[PDB]
C-alpha cells in the first residue's frame, strides 16, 4: 500500500486541519495518527473542507502541534484492540491501554465505526435474560438487546450493583461485560477501578470479567464522543466472537449527548436558542443501532444515568423511560430499611414485563407482587398513623405477605464478600419465580420474617428458618 501522509494546516483548538494529496484523502470517521513526544495522538475526520484538506477532531490534547507535521493515515476508523486480552484493562478512546499494565496483546483491531445491521436483521423477539438477582430479573426483567438502565443516587450501592451484575452475567450467562467512561470524573473513575480490583472479579493474574474501557473527559469532546463507540466495538466483538449475552454499561447518556453537542458546535453546527438539543439525532441513533440482538449473541446496554437533582435538562436524559425497556432505580429509602439491593420494586418497571414476553406465570407473579407491595405501603401509612390495630385480617394477610416479599428482596452479592462479608449467591430465574410465587400464596407464612431477610431462594429461606429455630428459638 502507498504511504498515505498529510501536512497539518490549521489547529482549531481541538480541531486540526490536515492537507493531503490527490486520492490520498481519507474518508470521514477515519483515524489519522500523528507522532508526538507525549505518546501517540490520532484524529478522526468529520468534515471535508476541500482543496485536499480534511477537518479532523483530536482524541487528545493538541499540545506542541506544528504546521507541516506529518499525519499518517491508518486506513479506516479508529481501530481498537479487541479480545479477551482487553478484559480488566483500562483502554482509552484511541486504544492504547492507559492502565500502566503494558501493551494489549490483542490479535484483532475492529474499527469503531462498523456498519450497523439492517432493518430486516433487527430481531423484534423479546426474551428476558436471567441476571442472578431475583428483584431485577422478576420485578423489572432486563430486555435482551434493548436499552435498560440504572437510576440511583450516591451511597446507595450503584457501583456494587454494577459489580454484581457483571459478575452474575460472567457466571450465569458465561458472558463478559464492558463499562464505558464517557464524561467521567477521574476521582470516581479511580474509586471504581479500585473497587473493581478489590472485589476480586478482575483477577489481574487470572480471569477478568469486565473490559473496562475508560476515557477521561479532560480530553477534547471527540474523545468523549468516541469512547462510547470503542466500548460498543469491544462489546460487539465479544458478542460476535463468543456465544455470550454480554451486557454493556454506559455510565451516562447525558455526558455522551453533551459531548456530541459540543462536537457539533465545534464542527459548525448549532442548537436552538434558550436551550434545546436536537442535534444528537445522528449520533444517538447510531449508538442505539449499535446495540441490537444478533443471531449468535447480544448486547444489553445499561444506562446508569445518575439523577441530576430530580431535574433532567437535556432532551435525551429528559424522560429516559421512552428509551428504557427495564427501569432499575436505586432509591435510598429501600437501602435505609437495610435491604442490600437498592432496587425499588414499585418504581422499577419494565416494558417487557408482559404475559406474551416473559411468560404467563412470570407476569402473574410480578403483577401480584407489585399489587401486594402497593397495598403494603398503602396500609403502612395507616399502620404508622392509626396503629397496627386499625387493620383487617385480609389486610393483615396482604401486609405480611408483602413484607415477606420485601424482606426476601434482600439477597447476597458475590462481589460484596469483602465489602461486608456475605456469602454471595446466584439465583435462578425459574427458582426466583418458584420462590416468589411460593411466598405469594402464603404457604410460607409460618416461616419467621427474619428468615426471609438476607437470603436468596426458598431453599435458603427454609434453611435460615430452621437455623433460627435451632440456634435462637
Amino acid at each position: 500500500s502507498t504511504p498515505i501522509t498529510g501536512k497539518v494546516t490549521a489547529v482549531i483548538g481541538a480541531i486540526v486541519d490536515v492537507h493531503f494529496e490527490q486520492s490520498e484523502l481519507p474518508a470521514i470517521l477515519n483515524a489519522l495518527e500523528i507522532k508526538t513526544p507525549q505518546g501517540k495522538l490520532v484524529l478522526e475526520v468529520a468534515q471535508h473542507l476541500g482543496e485536499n484538506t480534511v477537518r479532523t477532531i483530536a482524541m487528545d490534547g493538541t499540545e506542541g502541534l506544528v504546521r507541516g507535521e506529518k499525519v499518517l493515515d491508518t486506513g479506516g476508523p479508529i481501530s481498537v484492540p479487541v479480545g479477551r486480552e482487553t478484559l480488566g484493562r483500562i483502554i482509552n478512546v484511541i486504544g492504547e491501554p492507559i492502565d500502566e499494565r503494558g501493551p494489549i496483546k490483542s490479535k484483532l483491531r475492529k474499527p469503531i465505526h462498523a456498519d450497523p445491521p439492517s432493518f430486516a436483521e433487527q430481531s423484534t423477539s423479546a426474551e428476558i435474560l436471567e441476571t442472578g438477582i431475583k428483584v431485577v430479573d422478576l420485578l423489572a426483567p432486563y430486555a435482551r438487546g434493548g436499552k435498560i438502565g440504572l437510576f440511583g443516587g450516591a451511597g446507595v450501592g450503584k457501583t456494587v450493583f454494577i459489580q454484581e451484575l457483571i459478575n452474575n452475567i460472567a457466571k450465569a450467562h458465561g458472558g463478559f461485560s464492558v463499562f464505558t467512561g464517557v464524561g467521567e470524573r477521574t476521582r470516581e473513575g479511580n474509586d471504581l477501578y479500585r473497587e473493581m480490583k478489590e472485589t476480586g472479579v478482575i483477577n489481574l493474574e487470572g480471569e477478568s470479567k469486565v473490559a473496562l474501557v475508560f476515557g477521561q473527559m479532560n480530553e477534547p469532546p471527540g474523545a468523549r464522543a468516541r469512547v462510547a463507540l470503542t466500548g460498543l466495538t469491544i462489546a460487539e466483538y465479544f458478542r460476535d466472537e463468543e456465544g455470550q449475552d454480554v451486557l454493556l454499561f454506559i455510565d451516562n447518556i447525558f455526558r455522551f449527548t453533551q459531548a456530541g453537542s459540543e462536537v457539533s458546535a465545534l464542527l459548525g453546527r448549532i442548537p436552538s436558542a434558550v436551550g434545546y438539543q436536537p442535534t444528537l439525532a445522528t449520533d444517538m441513533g447510531l449508538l442505539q443501532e449499535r446495540i441490537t440482538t444478533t443471531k449468535k449473541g447480544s448486547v444489553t446496554s445499561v444506562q446508569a444515568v445518575y439523577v441530576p437533582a430530580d431535574d433532567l435538562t437535556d432532551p435525551a436524559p429528559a424522560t429516559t423511560f421512552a428509551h428504557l425497556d427495564a427501569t432499575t432505580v436505586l432509591s435510598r429509602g429501600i437501602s435505609e430499611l437495610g435491604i442490600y439491593p437498592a432496587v425499588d420494586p414499585l418504581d422499577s418497571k419494565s416494558r417487557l414485563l408482559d404475559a406474551a414476553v416473559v411468560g404467563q406465570e412470570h407476569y402473574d407473579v410480578a403483577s401480584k407482587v407489585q399489587e401486594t407491595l402497593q397495598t403494603y405501603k398503602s396500609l403502612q401509612d395507616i399502620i404508622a398513623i392509626l396503629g397496627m390495630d386499625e387493620l383487617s385480617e385480609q389486610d393483615k394477610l396482604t401486609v405480611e405477605r408483602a413484607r415477606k416479599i420485601q424482606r426476601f428482596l434482600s439477597q447476597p452479592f458475590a462481589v460484596a464478600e469483602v465489602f461486608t462479608g456475605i456469602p454471595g449467591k446466584l439465583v435462578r430465574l425459574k427458582d426466583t419465580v418458584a420462590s416468589f410465587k411460593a411466598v405469594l400464596e402464603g404457604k410460607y407464612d409460618n416461616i419467621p420474617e427474619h428468615a426471609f431477610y438476607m437470603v436468596g431462594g426458598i431453599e435458603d429461606v427454609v434453611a435460615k428458618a430452621e437455623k433460627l429455630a435451632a440456634e435462637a428459638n
Partner: protein, 84 residues
C-alpha cells in the same frame, strides 16, 4: 507543584464564570464557531482540563493532593444555563 512534591495544596477557582466569558470572547474573536449561549463548545474541555488537575494522588507520588473550590457567579439563581 505542591501536589506532585508530596505536599497538600488548595486551589480556589474564584469566579470561573468570567473565565468562561473571557474564553468565549477569545474564541468568538478568533473565528471559532459559536456554540451554546455563544460559548464555544470547548469551554467544557477547558474546565474539565483545569479541574482534573486538582486531585488526590496515591501514596506513590508522596500522597500530595490538590483541592479545587471554584465558584460560578450565576445570575438569578438559574444554574440551568450551559456553563453552570
Amino acid at each position: 507543584w505542591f501536589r506532585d512534591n508530596g505536599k497538600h495544596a488548595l486551589i480556589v477557582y474564584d469566579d470561573l464564570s468570567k473565565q468562561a466569558v473571557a474564553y468565549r470572547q477569545l474564541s468568538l474573536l478568533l473565528r471559532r464557531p459559536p456554540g451554546r449561549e455563544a460559548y464555544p463548545g470547548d469551554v467544557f474541555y477547558l474546565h474539565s482540563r483545569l479541574l482534573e488537575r486538582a486531585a488526590k494522588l496515591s501514596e506513590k507520588e508522596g500522597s500530595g493532593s490538590l483541592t479545587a473550590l471554584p465558584v460560578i457567579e450565576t445570575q438569578g439563581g438559574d444554574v440551568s444555563a450551559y456553563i453552570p
